[PDB]
């Protein structure tokens, strides 16, 4: 599904993401916007290591979720990648929460560092009553 901005905002808030490990909700929204356009079905294949990024957050199959076809795969979220391609984002959220539990935090995603870090992100949540 392609979420609308405020709808995504409220669902993430509901799911406990506002301020998780000090990351505000606007930061998570900015990340989803650049990573998938808010589309739960986004995918990206990385030929270099043969991994694939999945869902709204573009979670990678070599370290996070298991897709049965990525060598070296470590499955830190203990979750099949195919669960990140559906319309319910609660597992995506649980897995993204685990990712930021590592030392890099949200800097794990290069898109966030390039398009979000240090910038004004209030546009992502303006008008959502979040
Ligand atoms: Ca899901």
Curated annotation (Swiss-Prot):
SMART domains: LYZ1. It is found in: Secreted. Disulfide bonds join 6-128, 30-116, 65-81, 77-95. The active site is at residues 35, 53. It is an enzyme of class 3 (hydrolase). One of its GO terms (biological process) is inflammatory response. Gene3D superfamilies: 1.10.530.10. Transmembrane segments: none annotated. GO terms for cellular component: azurophil granule lumen; extracellular exosome; extracellular region; extracellular space; specific granule lumen; tertiary granule lumen. One of its GO terms (molecular function) is identical protein binding. CDD domains: LYZ_C. It catalyses: Hydrolysis of (1->4)-beta-linkages between N-acetylmuramic acid and N-acetyl-D-glucosamine residues in a peptidoglycan and between N-acetyl-D-glucosamine residues in chitodextrins. Keywords: Amyloid, Amyloidosis, Antimicrobial, Bacteriolytic enzyme, Disease variant, Disulfide bond, Glycosidase, Hydrolase, Secreted, Signal. Its EC number is 3.2.1.17. Pfam families: Lys (PF00062). Monomer. Belongs to the glycosyl hydrolase 22 family. Lysozymes have primarily a bacteriolytic function; those in tissues and body fluids are associated with the monocyte-macrophage system and enhance the activity of immunoagents. PANTHER family: LYSOZYME C. This is Lysozyme C. It comes from Homo sapiens (Human). The lineage of its organism: Eukaryota, Metazoa, Chordata, Craniata, Vertebrata.
């Amino acid at each position: 599904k392609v979420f609308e901005r405020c709808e995504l905002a409220r669902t993430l808030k509901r799911l406990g993401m506002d301020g998780y490990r000090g990351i505000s909700l606007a930061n998570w929204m900015c990340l989803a916007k650049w990573e998938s356009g808010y589309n739960t079905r986004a995918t990206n294949y990385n030929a270099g290591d043969r991994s694939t990024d999945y869902g709204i957050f573009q979670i990678n199959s070599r370290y996070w979720c298991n897709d049965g076809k990525t060598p070296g795969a470590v499955n830190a979220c203990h979750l099949s990648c195919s669960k990140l391609l559906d319309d319910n984002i609660a597992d995506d959220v649980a897995c993204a929460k685990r990712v930021v539990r590592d030392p890099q935090g949200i800097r794990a995603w290069v898109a966030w560092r390039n398009r979000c870090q240090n910038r004004d992100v209030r546009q992502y949540v303006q008008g959502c009553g979040v």
